[PDB]
Amino acid sequence: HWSAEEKQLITSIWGKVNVADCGAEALARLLIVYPWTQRFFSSFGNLSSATAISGNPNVKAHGKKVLTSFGDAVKNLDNIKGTFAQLSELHCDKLHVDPENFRLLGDILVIILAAHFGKDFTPECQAAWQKLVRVVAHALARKYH
Amino acid sequence: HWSAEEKQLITSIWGKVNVADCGAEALARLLIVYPWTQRFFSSFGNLSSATAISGNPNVKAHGKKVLTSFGDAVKNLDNIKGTFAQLSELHCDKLHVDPENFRLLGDILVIILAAHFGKDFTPECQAAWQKLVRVVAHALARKYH
Amino acid sequence: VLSANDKSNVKAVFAKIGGQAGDLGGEALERLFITYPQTKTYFPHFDLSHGSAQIKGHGKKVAEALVEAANHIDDIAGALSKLSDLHAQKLRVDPVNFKLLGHCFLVVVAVHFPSLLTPEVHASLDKFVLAVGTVLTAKYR
Amino acid sequence: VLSANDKSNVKAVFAKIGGQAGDLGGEALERLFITYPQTKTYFPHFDLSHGSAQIKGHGKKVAEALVEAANHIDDIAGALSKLSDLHAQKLRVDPVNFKLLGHCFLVVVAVHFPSLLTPEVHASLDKFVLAVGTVLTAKYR
Ligand code: HEM
Numbered sequence A, B: 001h002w003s004a005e006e007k008q009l010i011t012s013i014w015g016k017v018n019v020a021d022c023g024a025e026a027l028a029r030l031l032i033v034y035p036w037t038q039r040f041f042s043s044f045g046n047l048s049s050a051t052a053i054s055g056n057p058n059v060k061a062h063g064k065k066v067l068t069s070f071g072d073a074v075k076n077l078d079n080i081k082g083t084f085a086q087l088s089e090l091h092c093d094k095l096h097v098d099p100e101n102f103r104l105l106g107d108i109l110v111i112i113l114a115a116h117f118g119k120d121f122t123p124e125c126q127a128a129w130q131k132l133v134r135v136v137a138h139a140l141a142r143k144y145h
Numbered sequence C, D: 001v002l003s004a005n006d007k008s009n010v011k012a013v014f015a016k017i018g019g020q021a022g023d024l025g026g027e028a029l030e031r032l033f034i035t036y037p038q039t040k041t042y043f044p045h046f047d048l049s050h051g052s053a054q055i056k057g058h059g060k061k062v063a064e065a066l067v068e069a070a071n072h073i074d075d076i077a078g079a080l081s082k083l084s085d086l087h088a089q090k091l092r093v094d095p096v097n098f099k100l101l102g103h104c105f106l107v108v109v110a111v112h113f114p115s116l117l118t119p120e121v122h123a124s125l126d127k128f129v130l131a132v133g134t135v136l137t138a139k140y141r
């Protein structure tokens, strides 16, 4: 599972990640690049354009909540399946979000970190963060199986 | 996670399934409908055409083997994750088969059952079998996640 | 991207189906809802009882669109242009759902016409059903 | 489908990249092998050491194909026609792998040009890379 060098690559980047800023960019990019995801957040407001989405207060506020949850995964790396048990019920039983969408949000997070950290986001660092988003994605889909 | 309603629909169908014929048909359709899957079975021989694939002795023999393992899922519905643990390590660690391919073979198996059983393959019967092939796929992808 | 062999297979399939298209569309929808219950969320107010007029009626409309795409198999994007706007821009249907409906339609063909759905014909219909899904998800603007 | 603004965004990306394309192709391949180790199975004899002549060489070829696709954005299928035969018919590449390489290319762009890859340019480049993957998997039968 997790090597010590994977733990250090994830922990080091996370120590420099502003949860509010990167969370906002994460969710905005998801709704903009994959527009069908907008159906799930229809009550957020005006999502008719990229700028409207990017500056929508609810999008910014929710993205912050999403990345705070990624922070909980960073703190409990060895028990991600247990940490995301309640959120698995919400997304599977109550929201009906297809699991492929969890993966697309993971991919987007990786792209945001890459844009924010540049050359410090090495291939090895990417490898570590892509593994994390996938473990988190499978933890959220757990109550479909 | 099974109701005895689902257990009955699975058991009743399976008791009529010729593992040799339905297995041969299953794998043949996989290699014909989704031709990139042929890469994994290149050593099988002549796979140039649909006629060549269907009559290939290694295809028929392996298809039979694929369905007999599905037969082990029919016997151990409550313990599917444990049954497919070794095959999971083979497909993931030795063969590097992407999980989506497990879903495709499941869908094909459902279509073969539909063709063989006609009116008896009811929507409710379909729902049970799609659930089973998805649980089998999830159990085979265990070593990835 | 369909070959002349594929186009021949699909046109053979919908010739065999003929006037039964409507009933099969209804069965495909019923199988979708039962097999993949998450799809119900797109039809929150539908009477989902077996053989309801809403399911029958919507099934016919779905089958109609597939029939039209078949006799315009050289230009599927133009024939379904209006429905691409409804599904992608208005309804925001998750792309994965089109794969599910397509699968259910193949199931329906297999149930009724096992002799028609040879492995070769199976391949052509799969590519046709996937081409239809691609058209209806084309414009997420 | 690619809109007029999407075409404009892709042109802006590759004009900015310019002569760096080759080296970016090499980094994308490197990131692919490291983050998705299953992809190495398609390149069993490659020297995989960081900045190997093989990775750099093949990376140049991948990037040049992407540049050609961009320059012929209204006819991507005709520009990468022969490459569709190699990937689909000869190499039998699993279609999911094209999604992975496309994503890696986006990562590489993000690393080097963060101010270029706005949310809207990201969307266009995503649609472009997915169109390339579609063309390269067009004909399997
Ligand atoms: C990367 C994986 C994801 C994580 C870690 C995550 C995290 C969260 C969190 C923390 C909440 C708030 C729960 C609460 O306040 O009680 C939430 C709610 C929600 N999630 Fe996600 N999310 C993820 C992916 C997705 C995706 C891809 C979608 C669909 C596009 C989605 C749809 C929703 C919706 C619609 C809500 C609102 C529920 C409410 O009414 O509060 N989630 N998620």
Ligand code: HEM
Pocket (backbone or CB within 6 Å): B037, B040, B041, B043, B065, B066, B069, B070, B087, B091, B095, B097, B101, B102, B105, B106, B136, B137, B140
């Ligand atoms: C429905 C899920 C699947 C099940 C239940 C299954 C089952 C099996 C079984 C029982 C074996 C024999 C192992 C042995 O004899 O030691 C096997 C081997 C193998 N499987 Fe599968 N399989 C599945 C999906 C797939 C798929 C989708 C592919 C390809 C995309 C694949 C590729 C292979 C290959 C290449 C072998 C070895 C064949 C050889 O002897 O050369 N499997 N599988």
Ligand code: HEM
Pocket (backbone or CB within 6 Å): C039, C042, C043, C061, C062, C063, C065, C066, C083, C087, C091, C093, C097, C098, C101, C102, C132, C133, C136
């Ligand atoms: C084979 C692919 C599909 C075809 C050919 C198709 C065709 C159609 C047609 C003909 C209509 C009726 C438009 C009218 O009122 O004239 C429609 C509407 C609709 N479709 Fe689809 N569709 C497909 C896939 C899907 C999928 C996968 C979903 C989601 C599960 C979906 C959800 C809907 C909804 C919610 C409506 C509006 C129903 C209403 O408000 O009464 N469609 N589609």
Ligand code: HEM
Pocket (backbone or CB within 6 Å): D039, D042, D043, D061, D062, D063, D065, D066, D083, D087, D091, D093, D097, D098, D101, D102, D132, D133, D136
């Ligand atoms: C962005 C999409 C891709 C593009 C533009 C692309 C382009 C190319 C090009 C230009 C070549 C060289 C052909 C020649 O030498 O004439 C090639 C070969 C090759 N490609 Fe790709 N490719 C893509 C995706 C992939 C993927 C996802 C894989 C699988 C991981 C793959 C596997 C291969 C292999 C094994 C070769 C042959 C290399 C050798 O001779 O050892 N390609 N591709």
